[PDB]
């Protein structure tokens, strides 16, 4: 066991400990097949994360649900082991991604530190990582020239230089909300070395029409409302390398990040 | 009570009554508000439905959850009242639509009589109600000349004259499947006097491209797969009259049927 | 007579004058009814055309067939007056249209200046005036929404965006040839403010089938060869506004132009 | 605004529109004093130029540098407004002349249509406008009997009847080239009703010696090389009516045309 490795949180510690910063907690059981296959991974995770832990305000913790059974009942633990993110307000989300490695847990903590809503930090202080793609740039990506995956967003505008520029979108109720979402997505995907890009569909009509985003190219009074679109570009493939975002619109970044991270 | 009005089903009747045809059952309690403002409406529904009940093989029934509390318990009745569609194989779906009127309930039975999957009847014996729309025809609907709502389907082909013609769709995994679905949709919506149409996007490149369906127009090597698109045209409106089907793909007709029927 | 108005050409200046550019010559007799009610219209024209004469390299000239009788004899003048188009190479055609006005004469030179064969200029340098019509565009024209006449060409292909694009036509020996003809037609008719358009029948199967161009819609092994079809659409009429080109196929643009220019 | 008046060119159509013919483009800003008295002159220019536009392959167009700020940065726009000539290969020259009227803009288009280098047309098909002036004729011009200005060229030869005759010039490396230049000058000045003339200095030794072109009069081994000289004759003036072309030799016609057009 690593030197400073902390004891599980218990009913004397839980609320006092979660009242500052972020916590990634392993609700585990000493009575579990898979949870002793997590334990040594956890401690190495903890050990390698010691430095960033200080600077990102994120702590890896544990709860033994046998020694704290009523604690785990309050937190409504359904399975073992269960990995969760808390902030000072309480539960946020679970980390179900498999298989659990030191790499995957570290990436997840880094990913979550860049969500401004988690510690209500200020997104304006940060740059958007989203890259301005002219039509030609986007076509190069799709010709198989990407060396990393690119989540690309498409907009009913011609004036977006940075994805967070102040812009007035016509017949697009969700466009402004999605600029916040897109910026958060760009920074979270940057940890996984997945690129992001934005396309001005008004300046790239033929490309956006061919791709099925033709409704973003032009004002029409038959469609009341339009939404920004998102698609994934796979690196170093010359065909079938373009995949539209499958789920519905969301104000949350999570669906888009996890889509961009899928193995295809 | 109407003259022939059957009394509620009981444990001596239930499984035996449901072994043939379709049943639309009102699981109620004699001591609850919504189930006593429903009660006379059911009797309205039943008596008006007598002639169709036999030719459509659908029965309106009721269950007193006091005299048959264990029945309602076995079927997992959660609320009162609960209106449900049953098969000889068992539960199919619930009728949550409000307000419950004699018109809405009759419409539902007629609609459900037209799902081939309910009684394993043969869809191939029926005409598709879907009408062939040229691009020009569709713009006329969208200029405000629709006198009824039109749910329209858009396809990556040019050869679709009847929506259920024998066709080979290229790079479209779901298309064959959705012909069955689109055909059922056209028939169920004919009950509510809602029209349906199909468009050959290959015969209509500019229209489908501008509509945001440009991927159906043409083969490209970057998209593995395309799927047919669905849009609703509101009748007699000259603007904001075109609304895309919002949810994801389904092989079930129901979301598409309900989207086409909801108030805008 | 207008100020700079030239004297008739005579045998000493005649062939060296026609040795450059295009010439429109009025072979007349001073003792002729129709040849002296042409005279002032000829002077109106010349003066009105002064500015265009320089940039188009077209000259209105005259020959007195009594004072240069051996000249008119060499050219085999049949009647008086006879209006002829010459290039440096010699005679080209006569202008038989009546009634002769300043407008008709101006139009004629402008029309002839865009025939590439007159002064062997190269058509590749020019835009085609023929506009791309999809099915909906064409049906709008025929529903009566055209405000000028439209001569329309119909083709066995789906790949024609500009009427002069590089294309490989299947089972159509004349199509490549007719592309030049059609381009010259579009530019000559543009002088008379008549529009021209082209239709891809492979992209508009049902519209073209209904119109009687079904042989262009699809490859078949019954027909060895197909040719492009030509039809005229009259402006501002809601019925009986479509007229097929009546004469045979020609590599010449003029039969097609003159058809498009008829009074209805 | 006139009926068919085109909208400004933008980054999506700009390079496509310029791929054919000549374009005279008004690069403007809506927040520019000078660019708002041009706007109505521009729309007038366009409307009266509609007919010649077709036959000369010359189009008036615009780019708003507020709505197309990056295009104008790519085009290196320095001031507003900036009127420019483009061919398919790109920028040619700017139109800096003031004050801009409908007449000056039209005249400029006609002049540019007669430059063989702009659309690479064939100058040999056209006549030279340059008139043969014997010594006496030129002395008449200079006595003030010219009724239009006369740009006159002086040549080391005795054999020039037409300025584009096939000739061997002695000790004049540039003479052949300048025959092309002088021919272009003659046709372009013909648009503005400025005459051109040519003089054989070998046939007119005293006039040519006296004007300072004595070097063109006879073969001498003092000078390696001689060049044809150019002078302007002002109309209806009896003195100070003779002006040497002030700048250096050019194979380009533009300087000679502009000097001949200067008001004194």
Residue numbers in the entry:
A (entry chain A), B (entry chain C), C (entry chain B), D (entry chain D): 29 to 292
What does the paper say about this structure?
Based on amino acid sequence, Eps1p appears to be a four-domain protein with a carboxy-terminal membrane anchor.
The refined ND-Eps1p structure was used in turn to solve the structure of S. cerevisiae Esp1p Trx1-Trx2 (SC-Eps1p), crystals of which contained four molecules in the asymmetric unit and diffracted to 2.37 Å resolution. The interface in SC-Eps1p appears to consist primarily of salt bridges, between helix α4 of the Trx1 domain and helices α2 and α4 of the Trx2 domain, burying about 990 Å2. The distance between the two Cys-X-X-Cys motifs is about 46 Å in the SC-Eps1p structure. The relative domain orientation is the same in all four copies of SC-Eps1p in the asymmetric unit. In contrast, the SC-Eps1p Trx1 Cys-X-X-Cys dihedral angles show greater deviations among the multiple copies of the protein structure. This observation is consistent with the burial of the Trx2 Cys-X-X-Cys motif and its lower temperature factors in all four molecules. In addition, the proline juxtaposed to the Cys-X-X-Cys motif is found in the trans, not cis, configuration in the crystal structures of both Eps1p orthologs.
